[PDB]
Fold trao protein.
Amino acid sequence: LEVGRNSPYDYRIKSVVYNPVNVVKIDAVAGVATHIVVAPDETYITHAFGDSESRTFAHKMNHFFVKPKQAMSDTNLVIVTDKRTYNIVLHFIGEETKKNADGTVSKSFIET
Amino acid sequence: LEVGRNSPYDYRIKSVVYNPVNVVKIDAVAGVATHIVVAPDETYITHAFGDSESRTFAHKMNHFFVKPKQAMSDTNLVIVTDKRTYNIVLHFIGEETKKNADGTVSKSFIET
Amino acid sequence: LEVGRNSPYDYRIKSVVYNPVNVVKIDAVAGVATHIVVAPDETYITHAFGDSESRTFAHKMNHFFVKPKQAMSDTNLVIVTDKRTYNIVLHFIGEETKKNADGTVSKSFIET
Amino acid sequence: LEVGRNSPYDYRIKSVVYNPVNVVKIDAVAGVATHIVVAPDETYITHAFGDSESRTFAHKMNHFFVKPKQAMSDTNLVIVTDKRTYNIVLHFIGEETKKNADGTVSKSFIET
Amino acid sequence: LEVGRNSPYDYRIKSVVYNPVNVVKIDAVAGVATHIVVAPDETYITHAFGDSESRTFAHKMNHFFVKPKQAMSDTNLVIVTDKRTYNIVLHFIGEETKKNADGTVSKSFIET
Amino acid sequence: LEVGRNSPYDYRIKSVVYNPVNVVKIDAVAGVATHIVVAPDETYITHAFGDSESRTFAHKMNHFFVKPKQAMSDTNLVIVTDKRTYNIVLHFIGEETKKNADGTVSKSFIET
Amino acid sequence: LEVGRNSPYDYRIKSVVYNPVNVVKIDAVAGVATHIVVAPDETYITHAFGDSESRTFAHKMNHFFVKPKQAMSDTNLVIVTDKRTYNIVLHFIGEETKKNADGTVSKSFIET
Amino acid sequence: LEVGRNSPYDYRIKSVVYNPVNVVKIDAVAGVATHIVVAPDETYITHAFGDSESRTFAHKMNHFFVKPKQAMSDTNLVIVTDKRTYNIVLHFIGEETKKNADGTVSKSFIET
Amino acid sequence: LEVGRNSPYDYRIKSVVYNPVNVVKIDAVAGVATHIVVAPDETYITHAFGDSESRTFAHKMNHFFVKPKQAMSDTNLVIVTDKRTYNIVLHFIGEETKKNADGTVSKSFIET
Amino acid sequence: LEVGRNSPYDYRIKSVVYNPVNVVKIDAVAGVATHIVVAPDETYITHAFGDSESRTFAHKMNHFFVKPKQAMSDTNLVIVTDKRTYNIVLHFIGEETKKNADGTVSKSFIET
Amino acid sequence: LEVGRNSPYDYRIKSVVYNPVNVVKIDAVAGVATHIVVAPDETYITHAFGDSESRTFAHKMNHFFVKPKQAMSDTNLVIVTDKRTYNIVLHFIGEETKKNADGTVSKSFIET
Amino acid sequence: LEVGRNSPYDYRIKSVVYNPVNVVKIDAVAGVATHIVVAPDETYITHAFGDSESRTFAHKMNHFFVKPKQAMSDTNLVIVTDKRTYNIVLHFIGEETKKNADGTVSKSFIET
Amino acid sequence: LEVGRNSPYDYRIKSVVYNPVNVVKIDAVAGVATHIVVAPDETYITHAFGDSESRTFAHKMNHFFVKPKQAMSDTNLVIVTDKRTYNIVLHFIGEETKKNADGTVSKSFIET
Amino acid sequence: LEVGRNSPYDYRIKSVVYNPVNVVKIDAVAGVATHIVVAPDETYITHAFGDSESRTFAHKMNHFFVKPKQAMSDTNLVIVTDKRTYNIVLHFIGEETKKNADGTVSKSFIET
């Protein structure tokens, strides 16, 4: 939506539709105060993800993973957010009867 | 009604009748603070649907589904609201003795 | 009475008698904050009917039904209020010893 | 008395005697906030009758009945108040030892 | 006494003696806020009688009865107060040992 | 004493002695807020007598009796107070050991 | 003492000695708020006597008795106070051991 | 002492010694608010004596006794105080062990 | 000391020594608010003596005794204080172990 | 020390040493609010002695003893304080283990 | 991020990407109020590490280790922060199911 | 120290060293509010000694002893303080394990 | 860091690196309000060490030891802080599992 | 340190190093509000020592001992503080495991 999403959505909206640049599909298991993830390069300001406070640590490339695992369920929360370029593919299917996490996303993210 | 419906109806009204553009038939199992869905392209502002906080996640087309399932009952809450164009067909028949959900709608939605 | 009836009657009054245009016979099982139904085309503002919050959903014609069923009794609360033209025929006979619902109405309704 | 009687009488008074036009004999089982019935054509403002909130519903003629039945007793509360012309004949004899309802009235009522 | 007696007497007084016009003998079983009965033609303002709230209902003549019966005792409370002319004859003898109701009155009453 | 005695005496005083006109002998069983009885013709203002609220009712002459009976004892409380002329003869002998009621009075009373 | 004695004495004093005119010997069983008895002709203001509220009632002459009897004892409280002329003879001997009532008085009393 | 002694002594003092005129020997059983007895002729103001409220009643001469008897003991409290001339002889011997009442007085008293 | 001693001593002091005129030896059993006894001729102001309120009563001479007896012990409290001339001889020996009353005094007292 | 010692010492001090005139040796069993004894001739102001309120009473000479005895012990508290000249010899030896009273004094005392 | 990170992250962000100079990878088991570690040379201000308050003590080189060990788990918290140059290699794998500590970092750090 | 020591020391100090004149060695068992002893000749102001309120009483010479004995122990508290010249020798050895009283003093004391 | 460290570190920081002059390695078991130790020569202000309040007492050289021993463990807390020159070598290894005290320091310290 | 140390140290500091004049080594068992001991010659102000309130009493020389013994342990607290010259040698070794008292001092002290 805006630069910094800064939003609990509350849930999905009038996602300001775009070309894939500014807006990214931040969604996947989320909630844990993520203003926006991706953009801007200025302070989102920052997010926790996975409704946890774990996140991956090794560096993939320049841009490099993070991956809170939420529950025991499949919780491949990635946010390769370095602030270089940026590729991540989320999916989600936890407690099968959930608040539909099923659909999965991918994020592109140029800052440039 | 208005641009942003912004309304709990309270229930159906003097729906400002139209050609199918601005006003859409948002109805179906609803309640969970949906100001308006569809229009405007400006902030409705946003809705939850299904009286839940689930919603579909895969992307259908540009404009792409969302589908909170309310109860266990037939709860095909769709709102393909991308903000491209827009096609969705709702129906509803849950707890058969309900607050008549029976009648079902369809939404058109050009923003253009 | 006025444009927007806006009234709990309290009960029937000096119904401003008319030709069938402005004033309509809103009556039938009612109570659930119906200001006026029918007219105006401007905000009545809106009504619930049937002392419920059910109402019919399919679209009859342009102008199209709504029908809260109040109790289990015969509760054919119709308000075909679209805001096109408008035809509905109410009747009422619930708990036979009631607050006389027996007499039944019909509503005409041109906005034009 | 006045235009709008607007009165709990408290009980019968110096009924401003007339020709049968303005003042009508509103009396019969009453109490339930009837300001005046009949006249004026302007807001009485309105009455309940029968110390109930039932009233007849079918339309007799233009001017047309209403008839709260008070108790189980003979309670032919009519007020054919349309605001056309107007004919009604009340009588009353409920719990035989009552607050004398025995005497019965008739109402004329031209607005013209 | 005055135009509108407007008085609980408290009990009988210096009844402003007259010719039978203005002052009438209102007395008989009374108490229930009768300002004055009879005169004036302007607002007494009004009375209940019989220490009840019953009163006769049929119309005798133009001027026409009212008759709260107080107790079971002989309680011929008449006030034929129409505001035409006016004839009534009260008497009283209830609980024989009472607050002497024995003596009985008659009321004349021209308004003219 | 004064025009309107207006007094609980407290008990007998310097009765302003007279010719029998203005001052009358109001005494006999009394107490029940009698300002003055008799004079003036203007508002005494009024009395109850007999320490009761009974009083005679028939009309003797123009001026005409009233007679609260106090107790069961001999309680011939008369006050023929019409405001014409005026004759009454009181006596008193109740509970023989009383607050001496024994002595009895007579009242004259011209207003003229 | 003064015109109106107006006094509880408290008890006997410097009785302003006189010729028998103004001051009278009011004494005898007393107490019950007697300002002065006798004089003046203006408001004493008034007395009760006998520490009671009985007093004689018949009229002796113009000036005429009053006689509260105090107790059962000899209590010939006279005050022939009319406000004509005036003769009374008191004596007193009640509960023989009393607050000496023994001595007895006489009152003269010209107003003239 | 002064004109009106006006004093509880508290007890005997610097009795302003005199010739027997102004000051008198008021003493004897006393206490009961006697300002002064005797003089002046103006308001002492007054005394009770005998620590009682009895006092003699017959008239001796012009000036004439009063005699509260205090206790059962010898209590010849005299105060012949008329306000003519004046002779009295007190003595005292009550409860033999008392607050010495033994010594006895006499009072002269010219006002002249 | 001063004119009016006016003092509880507290106890004996710098008795302003004199010739026997002004200051007198007031002492003996004392305490009961004696300001000064003897002098002045103006208000001491007055004393009680003997820590009692008894005092002698007969008149000795012009100047004449008073004699509260304090306890049962020898308590010849004299104060012949008339305010003529003045002779008294006190002594004291009560409860033999006392607050030494033993020593005894004499008082002279000219006022002249 | 000063004129009026006026002091609880608190205990012995820098006794302003002298010739025996002004300062005297007041000491011996003392305490009972003795400001100073002896001097001045003006108000010490006064003392009690002996921690009692006994003191001798006879007159020795002009200047003359006083002698509170404190306890049962040897308590020859003398203060011959007249305010003439003045001789006294104190000693002290009470409860042998005391607050050393042993040492004894003598007082001279000219006022002159 | 900034000079002094001064931040609880809250968790990893839009790490202002760099060349390895200013920003360092402070991460590893942390939390214990570390504003920033490394840079600036001005007051970070300072950190605790290891969520403890242990840290290594020997000096490695100029720049020299510190190493809080957090738990019993592998907790090689190094911060060779001298403020010379600076080399440290962290890794982390404690309670294997943790908040992913797995990924490990290295810090470069020139101040120059 | 100062003129009037006026001090609880608190304990020994920078005793302003002297020739033996002004400062004296006041010490020995002390405490009981001794400002200074000895000097000045002006108000120390005064001391108690011996932590008692005993002190010697006889007069040695002009300057003359005082000697509170503190406990049962050897407590030769002397202060020959007259304010002439002055010689005293204290020593102290009470409860052998004390707050060292052992060392003993001597006081010289010229005022001159 | 600063002149007076004045700091609880909180723990080790951006130790302002130096030549060994100003900053010293104060560390070793510490905590007990040591602002800085060593420098400055002006008020650190001062330290306790060893988290105790013991410290060595003999004088080594000019500059001379102090050595609180903390626990029973090896606690060679030295601070030879005289403020001459200055040599001390700390080490630490107490409760082997501690908050790493293991690493040990040495302090140089010229003030010059 | 300063003239008057005036300090609880808190413990040993940046003892302002000196030649042995001003600063002295006050230390040894101390605590009991010693501002400074030794210097200045002006008010330290004063000390207690030994954490007691004993101190030696005999005079050694001009300058002369004082010696609170603290506990039962070896507690040779000397402070020969006269304020002449001054020599004292402290040592300390009480409860062997103490807050190191072991090291012992010596004090020089010229005031000159």
